[PDB]
């Protein structure tokens, strides 16, 4: 009962078995949970010669609306994933609890630390209430995201240290509930030179249909009828096997087409909600493809997962644009 991996893991339909044990919690919301399932699955250094450490952990968010069951999405991650941390909004000033301290054996060694990313590397950070923190701490957290490193002073020491881990947040916006499909930069005061560091977006937009209200109500009432296809028993181990041992790659396949799609992205998106159109989120696409083939243990990949990634981004980036929600739709039925 250890090769249960290769008892099922090579069948085709089990791509969507990510979701049947992602969080069997809440009727709708498949897309965002599959996306989290991806971003929990990935990791690679791919360090080239001498330059730097590239990236293998990725920014997420769901700045939606106060009500959508999203808090609860994240606790499954904490109780399921290997390594994580305890925090809400309103941490320190990001200076940290007794961080800067010069070194003597007076005051009984005078404890040292710099925050918490140092304390969970190759793990994840749980945060909520992004829009409800002292700006000068959410300032300070703005180095780990891509550079994955810290660097300090203001003691008798100038030691340095890496901060390699993963971010996830599910906060709330300004303005009560949520605008309509009206733009994002108008909808919450998260500035330009950060949300670019953020890549993969999602939004829990809600509006009123009676049918799905009946459906999910039935689902909830049944969810409180617990009286007296995977379990959680395994995907823990599947992700450990996938994140530790296998170390996939890429090959020359069709990688010119990403250029045309990024070009369509930036040209059709100039001044509407078009500030967060940068190069890490097109790091992310090919990297997510590698994560998909990691979810297969394929170790290489064909056009399938690349088209899936490009599909997801068509989806989300259409979601966070106007009531005319079909601009890229009409522009993209030829790829779809």
């Amino acid at each position: 009962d250890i090769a249960t991996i290769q008892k099922l893991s090579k069948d085709p339909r089990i791509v969507e078995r990510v979701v049947a044990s992602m969080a069997p919690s809440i009727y709708g919301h498949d897309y965002i949970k599959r996306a989290l399932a991806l971003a929990l699955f990935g990791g690679e250094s791919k360090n080239p010669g001498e330059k730097h450490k590239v990236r293998g952990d990725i920014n997420l968010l769901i700045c939606g609306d106060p009500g959508t069951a999203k808090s609860q999405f994240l606790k499954y991650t904490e109780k399921v994933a290997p390594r994580a941390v305890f925090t809400t909004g309103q941490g320190a000033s990001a200076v940290g609890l007794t961080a800067y301290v010069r070194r003597n054996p007076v005051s009984r060694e005078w404890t040292l630390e710099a925050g918490a990313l140092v304390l969970a590397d190759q793990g994840v950070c749980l945060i909520d209430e992004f829009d409800k923190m002292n700006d000068q701490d959410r300032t300070s957290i703005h180095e780990a995201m891509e550079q994955q490193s810290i660097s300090i002073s203001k003691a008798g020491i100038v030691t340095s240290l890496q901060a390699r881990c993963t971010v996830i947040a599910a906060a709330n916006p300004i303005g009560g509930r949520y605008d309509p499909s009206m733009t994002f930069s108008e909808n919450v005061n998260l500035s330009e030179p950060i949300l670019s560091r953020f890549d993969v977006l999602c939004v829990v937009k809600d509006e009123f249909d009676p049918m799905q209200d009946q459906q999910l109500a039935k689902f909830v009432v049944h969810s409180h009828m617990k009286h007296h296809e995977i379990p959680q028993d395994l995907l823990r181990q599947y992700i450990v096997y996938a994140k530790e041992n296998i170390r996939p790659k890429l090959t020359n396949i069709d990688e010119d087409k990403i250029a045309k799609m990024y070009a369509q992205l930036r040209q059709e998106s100039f001044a509407t909600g078009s500030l967060p159109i940068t190069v890490r989120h097109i790091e992310s696409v090919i990297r997510m493809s590698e994560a998909h083939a990691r979810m297969h243990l394929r170790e290489n990949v064909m056009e399938a997962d690349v088209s899936m990634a490009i599909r997801m981004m068509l989806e989300s980036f259409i979601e966070a644009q106007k009531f005319s929600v079909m601009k890229k739709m009409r522009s993209t039925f030829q790829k779809y």
Binding site: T139, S153, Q162, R197
Partner: protein, 576 residues
């Protein structure tokens, strides 16, 4: 046994080392050390296998004794050759040995009880170390009871006219940043050094080390010393003060110098993975080289180095560039959150006010920071001062030791709302202009759109970001190669030449700066609403740097048209 070693083996070992070509000895090396007062000698650890097959496997286990049988053999083999006749051994003298190897480096995390009183090899990094007190060998530990009418119970008077004296320094070691500090912080260790190896290692360097893990007094204590240190070759891991460079190296260097396709070669040197951004890059490399620190009969120790600026929208590879400038002679990096105070703490031993002192640590190195922006003003004023006079002052308690340090500086930034400020007027900085004035470079970054550039920056990055590509095809380009060369090459070029200008450069530069200031004042008057000595005294440093590059002392203003057309970028940037 103590003597069968010295009786023949070590004593004849040095005598017996023989390859024709009549070099392969340690005898001539010993004598040519002796003549010049050095008093040391170096060996490997896998030459003894070329003499025998046992002694080495005894050298590891009982080193502390063997490494004195060596000293006795050394001097008794060397004082025979001191003798020209029996009339010029004025008196004998003691020596210290060095041994080296190429076996394999280790890590601090395996230094445990079994690796004790035993030889090793490691590789770490340094923070700081002590001063130079003392220690000696003999004079005229337990000093027992007997005396030598009575003279009672240990009356021993040291005769320190008749004592001796060797050195003592207490070096230090921290680990490397890639051996599981991930869920931790880095530990470190203190050390020991003996006779001729103080002022051999300044802190802030990469080391190889040959040492031994031995104690002083069951919870008893650790320490280590040098058993014949050597150093690192992370490109040029330790090439920071001394010279084992050879005429071959000087030859290759200066043969590179006269090669008049080196600078445009070097504008493509830093990024074997990034496209474009070349005029941004033509003076990130000159910043290393530095100009001239010309003091005069009056006070004017005028500003030697240069300083850098950049602010721009994200998405143009700021961070990697600054990390690379840290990578390629000596430097450090923080960014924000750190100081305005210096370090007047107190060792709890003796209760005094010592001065631990880290712009100190770039006194020939440099420094780079990002986020002058997102670190507020309580720590900007000490650095307001340092980078214009370099006389870092101190006046806190009863000490006024205004020490100094020569450092340059590099600045990244982040402006609010992207080019929102950069299109309109006065939101370039939000804070003040006198650290925007007190710098040299003025280089803004934008990320403007164009489909050709889009598609190119698309495929240019993919071949970079595909499967650790650059094994074969990077160095096969023309001359964009070998940062290690750049390290050693700089530590030559800065430390030789004393350049300064010609005649013809002066008038052209004066007229040019005149037109610059006049254009600024006309922009003041042509808008009915609103030029330092620093700008001249800095742009002169780019001529300084260029003449530093080609190794010509005297440089021209036609040579410097490139520099002033670089400063043109600054001028037409702060155009408004």
């Amino acid at each position: 046994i103590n003597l069968q070693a010295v009786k023949k083996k070590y004593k004849e070992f040095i005598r017996t080392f023989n390859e024709e070509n009549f070099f392969y000895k340690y005898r001539d090396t010993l004598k040519r050390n002796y003549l010049n007062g050095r008093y040391f000698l170096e060996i490997e650890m896998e030459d003894l296998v070329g003499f025998d097959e046992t002694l080495a496997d005894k050298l590891n286990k009982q080193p502390t004794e063997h490494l004195e049988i060596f000293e006795e053999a050394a001097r008794e083999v060397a004082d025979e050759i001191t003798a020209p006749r029996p009339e010029h051994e004025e008196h004998m003298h003691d020596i210290q040995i060095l041994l080296s190897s190429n076996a394999n480096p280790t890590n601090i995390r395996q230094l445990k009880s079994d690796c004790v009183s035993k030889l090793v090899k490691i590789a770490g990094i340094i923070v700081a170390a002590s001063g130079i007190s003392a220690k000696a060998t003999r004079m005229s530990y337990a000093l027992p009871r007997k005396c030598n009418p009575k003279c009672p119970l240990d009356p021993f008077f040291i005769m320190p006219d008749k004592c001796k004296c060797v050195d003592f320094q207490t070096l230090k070691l921290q680990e490397l940043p890639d051996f599981v500090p991930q869920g931790e912080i880095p530990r470190h260790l203190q050390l020991f050094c003996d006779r001729s190896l103080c002022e051999r290692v300044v802190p802030g360097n990469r080391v190889l080390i040959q040492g031994i893990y031995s104690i002083r007094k069951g919870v008893r204590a650790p320490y280590m010393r040098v058993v014949g240190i050597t150093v690192d070759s992370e490109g040029a891991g330790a090439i920071s003060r001394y010279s084992n460079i050879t005429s071959d190296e000087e030859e290759h260097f200066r043969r590179m110098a006269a090669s008049g396709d080196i600078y445009e070669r070097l504008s493509q040197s830093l990024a074997p993975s990034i496209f474009g951004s070349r005029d941004i890059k033509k003076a990130i490399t000159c910043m290393l080289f530095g100009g001239s620190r010309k003091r005069l009969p009056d006070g004017l120790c005028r500003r030697g180095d240069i300083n850098v600026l950049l602010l721009g929208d994200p998405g143009t590879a700021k961070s990697q560039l600054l990390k690379f400038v840290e990578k390629v002679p000596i430097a450090v990096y923080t960014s924000g959150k750190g100081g305005l105070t210096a370090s007047v703490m107190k060792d709890p031993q003796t209760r005094n006010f010592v001065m631990e002192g880290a712009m100190v640590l770039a006194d020939g190195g440099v420094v780079c920071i990002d986020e002058f922006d997102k670190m507020r003003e309580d720590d900007r004023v000490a650095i307001h001062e340092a980078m214009e006079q370099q006389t870092i002052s101190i006046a806190k308690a009863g000490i006024t030791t205004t020490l100094n340090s020569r450092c340059s500086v590099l600045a990244a930034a982040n402006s609010i709302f992207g080019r929102w400020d950069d299109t309109k007027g006065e939101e370039n900085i939000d804070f003040m202009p006198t650290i925007l004035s007190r710098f040299d470079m003025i280089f803004i970054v934008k990320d403007i759109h164009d489909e050709s550039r889009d598609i190119t920056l698309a495929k240019h990055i993919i071949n970079v970001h595909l499967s650790s590509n650059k094994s074969a095809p990077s160095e096969p380009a023309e001359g964009e190669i070998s940062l290690s060369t750049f390290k050693k090459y700089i530590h030559y070029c800065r430390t030789h030449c004393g350049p300064r200008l010609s005649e013809a450069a002066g008038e052209k530069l004066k007229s040019r700066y005149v037109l610059m200031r006049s254009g600024a004042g006309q922009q003041e008057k042509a808008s009915d609403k609103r030029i330092t000595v620093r700008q001249l005294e800095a742009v002169i440093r780019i001529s300084e740097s260029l003449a530093k590059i080609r190794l010509q002392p005297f440089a021209t203003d036609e040579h410097v048209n490139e520099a002033l057309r670089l400063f043109q970028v600054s001028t037409l940037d702060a155009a408004m």
